[PDB]
Write an enzyme that holds these catalytic residues in place. Structure first.
Site, PDB file in Angstrom:
ATOM      1  N   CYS B 166       0.794  -1.222   0.000  1.00 21.13           N
ATOM      2  CA  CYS B 166       0.000   0.000   0.000  1.00 21.13           C
ATOM      3  C   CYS B 166       0.829   1.276   0.000  1.00 21.13           C
ATOM      4  O   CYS B 166       0.560   2.196  -0.774  1.00 21.13           O
ATOM      5  CB  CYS B 166      -0.962   0.008   1.191  1.00 21.13           C
ATOM      6  SG  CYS B 166      -2.375  -1.107   1.017  1.00 21.13           S
ATOM      7  N   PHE B 217     -11.557  -5.131   2.177  1.00 25.06           N
ATOM      8  CA  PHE B 217     -10.973  -4.920   0.851  1.00 25.06           C
ATOM      9  C   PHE B 217     -12.024  -4.609  -0.219  1.00 25.06           C
ATOM     10  O   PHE B 217     -13.029  -5.329  -0.366  1.00 25.06           O
ATOM     11  CB  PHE B 217     -10.144  -6.137   0.440  1.00 25.06           C
ATOM     12  CG  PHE B 217      -8.903  -6.337   1.285  1.00 25.06           C
ATOM     13  CD1 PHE B 217      -8.228  -5.236   1.828  1.00 25.06           C
ATOM     14  CD2 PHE B 217      -8.427  -7.619   1.569  1.00 25.06           C
ATOM     15  CE1 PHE B 217      -7.066  -5.409   2.622  1.00 25.06           C
ATOM     16  CE2 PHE B 217      -7.280  -7.798   2.357  1.00 25.06           C
ATOM     17  CZ  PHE B 217      -6.597  -6.692   2.889  1.00 25.06           C
ATOM     18  N   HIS B 305      -4.514   6.686   4.916  1.00 23.47           N
ATOM     19  CA  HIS B 305      -4.850   5.383   4.355  1.00 23.47           C
ATOM     20  C   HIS B 305      -5.882   4.659   5.189  1.00 23.47           C
ATOM     21  O   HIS B 305      -5.628   4.304   6.330  1.00 23.47           O
ATOM     22  CB  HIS B 305      -3.615   4.501   4.236  1.00 23.47           C
ATOM     23  CG  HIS B 305      -3.917   3.116   3.754  1.00 23.47           C
ATOM     24  ND1 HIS B 305      -4.501   2.868   2.530  1.00 23.47           N
ATOM     25  CD2 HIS B 305      -3.734   1.907   4.338  1.00 23.47           C
ATOM     26  CE1 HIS B 305      -4.642   1.564   2.370  1.00 23.47           C
ATOM     27  NE2 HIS B 305      -4.183   0.959   3.451  1.00 23.47           N
ATOM     28  N   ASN B 338     -11.325  -0.532   1.758  1.00 26.93           N
ATOM     29  CA  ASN B 338      -9.881  -0.373   1.578  1.00 26.93           C
ATOM     30  C   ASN B 338      -9.447  -0.873   0.209  1.00 26.93           C
ATOM     31  O   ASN B 338      -9.392  -2.080  -0.059  1.00 26.93           O
ATOM     32  CB  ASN B 338      -9.143  -1.115   2.698  1.00 26.93           C
ATOM     33  CG  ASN B 338      -7.619  -1.117   2.533  1.00 26.93           C
ATOM     34  OD1 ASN B 338      -7.060  -0.604   1.559  1.00 26.93           O
ATOM     35  ND2 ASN B 338      -6.944  -1.667   3.519  1.00 26.93           N
TER      36      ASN B 338
END
Lengths: 391, 391
Positions: B166, B217, B305, B338
């Site tokens: 990431c 995710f 993030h 995410n």
């Protein structure tokens, strides 16, 4: 208002001059395979000695390969421990990855350490890590593993590049150039660790490209330290990285492909790659040296990615080079095979070494301007214009 | 002697001012999944409806996820077509790779087109492509495919980054900054296309980290155009990339791992990650901000993030942020989940948009300084210090 602060900051962190290569180290696995013996070993270890036609074919490819020896992690021990590697299309990816995740950062460590010793500076001055590998995708990757193995500062800016293709050899150097030139004091460790185990398969009449691959792929790693504004005492530039361009030839997308699959890597390598490079090399060079008033191709020293003998023959032919111009490249092809992205740095190192040996005036065989040709799947070529250093 | 020509060439191709973000476009797959419906979808299409306890546990995780909906490529149709993906440890890599090789560059094209549309310039002025992808390693990669899908120049310097982790969200931007600042006129297209099908597996009591992953995710792509010295008229900077730092926290190497295997990707996601991020975040920020004299954390706009809810809570807590500070980040986690590397740019886009919408003095919520925290496996954090643009 703060844009003023930003502009002062930005201006203060520029370099005065160009990025130069300050050191080069190379490394290989312990086991040497001589091409003379290679077809016997290969067809035997894969239980394929009845494939007589296919073996004659592979023997011919090796005879004409101008590869005399290679260094491989894929040993007989490894092949005995992993029989899945010897049956074509068998699930073997997990085993191959298990070797890679271990060996890739280690081989890179060996080549990096030789680079760092030549360089002479403390590790703590390394600000950037760019790690390029043919194979071994893992998270976190070989770049971090390298930082741990070397004890680089945790604050190094690391960059991991898995499976970009062999032109990475040049692409990475350009990035290093920018990293160095836009950051005063930056010292970039660039590591190519290329292990070819994903390309090993049992020979098959239905898949002939692998025979091509299997004749030439060798293991190797090279580390290059890149920096601008060298400290006059300790740091000694080997070559200056003057300018770098990239070309992806239209409609050649499929000339070289490599798919990561459950059986390992599935490879397509068009017989026409060297002819295409031959067609394009002169224009690439002409455009690359256009800012510098260079016109005599025999006045340059050369690092050409040794994808094979035909590649070298093709560049030599279409640039009208004298028979000795590609000697360093042929030498590396000869003693190491095609080690992917790392190869041109083996070549660079060699050019340098012979330059010292023959008491030449410059690190570039006595010449001042040089060109590194990094060639890979695309077809993509990175052309790097280099400048030698007086010795 | 030729060093004169070189230093002149080098001096001429520098940028006058800082690299800035000139546009942001994002994209997602068509099928929307509501978190309320997902354990039912997940445990049914995976043939695990008897696993009632595990399903209660996963439902439990989803309820706390602060994720409301996500865009996924892994549909029921896909699973009917590739059932190996729904039986744990079944060899399914070839199938997953087949989906990724198609989906990754296409999703990136959609985001890139929206970005290029906002930017307004002809494609031919794109000199650099940086493509980052969570997964889908292939040679040639998603980057060459994007150049083809978009009609980019064959002479664009392409750079492919597979499976970096990431933190690439920040890392790539720093690289773009150098590319932009060291090459006058260069325009860098940076694309993150993160498709998570390699993390999809049948739920297992022995593997609970994967449940967390499966709760958060989402698939997504973001494209960013980066350039220095924008033509004051037609190009309009959104944010300035002022400076960027990277830290790989010592001894956290195993907190997040993802291994590429025959069954897809094997994921380990430590429960201690958000706490660690919490512990190191203030120090990271202070060091990144040191040459600029910033000390009040609530005077900044934030792109954090959204690895999960806890990470956000932890950054908010340890920086002493007011509860509305992480509004855009939490928003993206709610509306998309995410999406790896691309996530922080969705957030950026959002911040920009709300900024225009609420008639703020600057593109960063009326504030001038901002931070983008890119967090990934390592544990590695890239800290990007940004400067807003007045509106």
């Amino acid at each position: 208002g703060s844009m003023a602060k930003v502009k002062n900051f930005l201006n203060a962190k520029r370099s005065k001059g160009p990025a130069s290569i300050l050191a080069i180290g190379t490394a290989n696995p312990p086991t040497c395979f001589n091409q003379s013996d290679y077809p016997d070993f290969y067809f035997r270890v894969t239980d394929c000695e009845h494939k007589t036609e296919l073996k004659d074919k592979f023997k011919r490819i090796c005879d004409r390969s101008a590869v005399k020896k290679r260094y491989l992690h894929v040993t007989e021990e490894v092949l005995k421990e992993n029989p899945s590697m010897r049956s074509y299309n068998a699930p073997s990816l997990d085993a191959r990855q298990a070797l890679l995740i271990e060996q890739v950062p280690k081989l890179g460590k060996e080549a990096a350490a030789k680079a760092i010793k030549e360089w002479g500076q403390p590790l703590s001055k390394i600000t950037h890590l760019v790690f390029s590998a043919m194979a071994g995708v893992d998270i976190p990757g070989a770049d971090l593993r390298l930082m741990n193995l070397l004890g680089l500062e945790p604050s190094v800016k690391r960059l991991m590049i898995y499976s970009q293709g062999c032109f990475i050899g040049g692409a990475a150097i350009r990035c290093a150039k920018d990293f160095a030139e836009n950051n005063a004091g930056a010292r970039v460790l660039v590591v190519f660790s290329d292990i070819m185990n994903m390309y090993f398969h049992e020979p098959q009449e239905a898949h002939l490209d692998i025979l091509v691959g299997q004749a030439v792929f060798g293991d190797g790693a090279a580390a290059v330290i890149v920096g601008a504004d060298p400290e006059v005492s300790i740091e000694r530039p080997l070559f200056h990285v003057v300018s770098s361009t990239q070309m992806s030839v239209p409609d050649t997308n499929k000339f070289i492909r490599a798919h990561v699959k459950e059986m390992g890597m599935e490879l397509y390598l068009s017989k026409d790659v060297p002819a295409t490079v031959g067609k394009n090399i002169e224009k690439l060079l002409v455009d690359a040296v256009s800012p510098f008033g260079i016109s005599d191709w025999n006045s340059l020293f050369y690092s050409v990615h040794p994808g094979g003998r035909a590649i070298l023959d093709q560049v030599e032919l279409n640039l009208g080079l004298g028979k000795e111009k590609l000697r360093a490249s042929r030498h590396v092809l000869s003693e190491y095979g095609n080690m992917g992205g790392s190869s041109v740095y083996f070549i660079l190192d060699e050019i340098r070494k012979k330059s010292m040996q023959e008491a030449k005036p410059t690190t570039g065989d006595g010449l001042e301007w040089g060109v590194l040709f990094a060639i890979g799947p695309g077809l993509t070529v990175e052309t790097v214009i280099l400048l030698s250093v007086p010795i």
